[PDB]
């Protein structure tokens, strides 16, 4: 049982609603495929406003509904993220513009930065911020993340 070590960082604005859902979904996939040992996974925020906070309780109870757990604490994306992760997957175009901007301040940027939605077989590019929404909104984010994360994995696996 041997291979190489790959890494992915999921990113949203606050790292409280979207990215912790994507991250947790992704860990479950990889675990279910017996390849966890070959992956480093994390989630982070463009913004420093929520650092140290637990995920929104609605995200927590949505994942629980699907049998998944998280212990994540919000953290900000940093300069090193760009040189240590293979892939940076974000939720929306704002996040995307933001990361590209920051990566420029990075000389040896080695991460590929892309929208997670770009992997959606259904083509819903954007994973909308559900903060002001209700439980069904969270559920749709979960659904999108599942699709996108399985597709991403199949191609980089």
**Catalytic residue list contains 92:** no
Whole-angstrom Cα distance, residue 46 to residue 37? 27
Domain ranges of the chain: 1-157
Beta bridge partners of 88: 9, 113
1-157: in CATH 3.40.50.2300: yes
Q: Is 106 helix (H, G, I), strand (E, B) or coil?
A: coil
Q: Out of 17, 18, 147, 149, pick the active-site residue.
A: 18
**Catalytic residue list contains 101:** no
Q: What separation in angstroms does the CA of 152 have from each of 14, 55, 58, 119? A: 23, 24, 25, 6
Whole-angstrom Cα distance, residue 24 to residue 31? 10
Number of H helices, E strands in the chain: 5, 4
């Amino acid at each position: 049982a041997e291979q190489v070590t790959k890494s992915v960082l999921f990113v949203c604005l606050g790292n409280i609603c979207r990215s912790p859902i994507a991250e947790a979904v992704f860990r479950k996939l990889v675990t279910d495929q017996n390849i966890s040992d070959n992956w480093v996974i994390d989630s982070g925020a463009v913004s420093d406003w929520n650092v140290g906070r637990s995920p929104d309780p609605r995200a927590v109870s949505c994942l629980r509904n699907h049998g998944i757990n998280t212990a994540h604490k919000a953290r900000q994306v940093t300069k090193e993220d760009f040189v240590t992760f293979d892939y940076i997957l974000c939720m929306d175009e704002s996040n995307l513009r933001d990361l590209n901007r920051k990566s420029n301040q990075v000389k040896n940027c080695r991460a590929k930065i892309e929208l997670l939605g770009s992997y959606d077989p259904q083509k819903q590019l954007i994973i909308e911020d559900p903060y002001y929404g209700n439980d069904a909104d969270f559920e749709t984010v979960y659904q999108q993340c599942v699709r996108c994360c399985r597709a991403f994995l199949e191609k980089v696996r």
